RNA sequence: GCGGUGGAAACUACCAAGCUGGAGUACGGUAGGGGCAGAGGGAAUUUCCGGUGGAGCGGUGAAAUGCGUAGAGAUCGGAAAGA
């Protein structure tokens, strides 16, 4: 089990080739995580909006032991996995308070690597 | 062409004396990522230290090497580091 409080943050690591749908409490002990590599298929298929939908659905379908009402989602990063994930959470329709972005916006910190030339 | 000699004085040069628009300086402002030195800053990244949780994470045209049950990645806190 857990603390049994039905409010908790959801983080969506939407990568450029993957998604991770994790869900955790206010302190930060994770109650479940499920990614595109978690839900079966793996390779070039993972990181597509069907993987965001299935990974989000298989992520938050297992919080029915909690039955969280007051949801709040804190996504991160670029990729094709955001909008399908928000349509998945709104499909489950639980009390999504506010979604938000927490993406790392650097202030010219490190040099990003070589351009691809492909 | 060179030399001697007699004349001219506009121009270059010369002698002397003024002139100011050229150029500077004095003064008052004024704008500036001009330079150098000293302090201070916060994102981000990486690594380490803790709590969670458990199988992938990462990557690609598609894969693979890598890393991961010695608990990775993700998440929250704690430091430190250089750029």
Which residue, A85, A62, A66, A67, is CA-closest to A75? A85
Considering only CA atoms, which of A3, A15, A11 is closest in space to residue A56?
A11
Bases of chain B below 7 A from a protein C-beta are 41-45, 51-53, 55-64, 72-76, 82-83
Q: Which domain holds residue A73?
A: 2-118
Answer for A43: CB within 7 Å of strand B.
yes
Helix (H, G, I), strand (E, B) or coil at A52: helix
Neighbours of A41 (CB within 10 A): 13
- Contact at 8 Å (CB) between A15 and A79? yes
Any idea what the CATH number is for the domain that residue A104 is in? 3.30.420.80
Distance A107 CA to B42 C1' (A): 9
Residue ranges in A20-74 assigned as alpha helix (H): 49-60
Shortest CA distance to A56 belongs to which of A28, A93, A27, A26?
A: A93
Domain count, chain A: 1
CB atoms within 10 A of CB A44: 8
Residue A18 CA, nucleotide B22 C1', distance (Å): 74
Does the CB of A105 sit below 7 A from strand B? Answer: yes
Task: Report the SS3 class of residue A69.
Answer: coil
> Residues 47-86, chain A: which have Cβ under 7 A from strand B?
47, 74, 76
């Amino acid at each position: 089990s857990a603390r049994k409080i039905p409010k908790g943050v959801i983080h969506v690591q939407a990568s450029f080739n993957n998604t991770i749908v994790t869900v955790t409490d206010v302190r930060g002990r994770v109650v479940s995580w499920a990614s595109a590599g978690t839900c079966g298929f793996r390779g070039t298929k993972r990181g597509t909006p069907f993987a965001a939908q299935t990974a989000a659905g298989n992520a938050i379908r297992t919080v029915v032991e909690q039955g969280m009402q007051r949801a709040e989602v804190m996504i991160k990063g670029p990729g094709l996995g955001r909008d399908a994930a928000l349509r998945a959470i709104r499909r489950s329709g639980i009390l999504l308070s506010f979604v938000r972005d927490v993406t790392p916006m650097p202030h010219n910190g490190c040099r990003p690597p070589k351009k691809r030339r492909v």
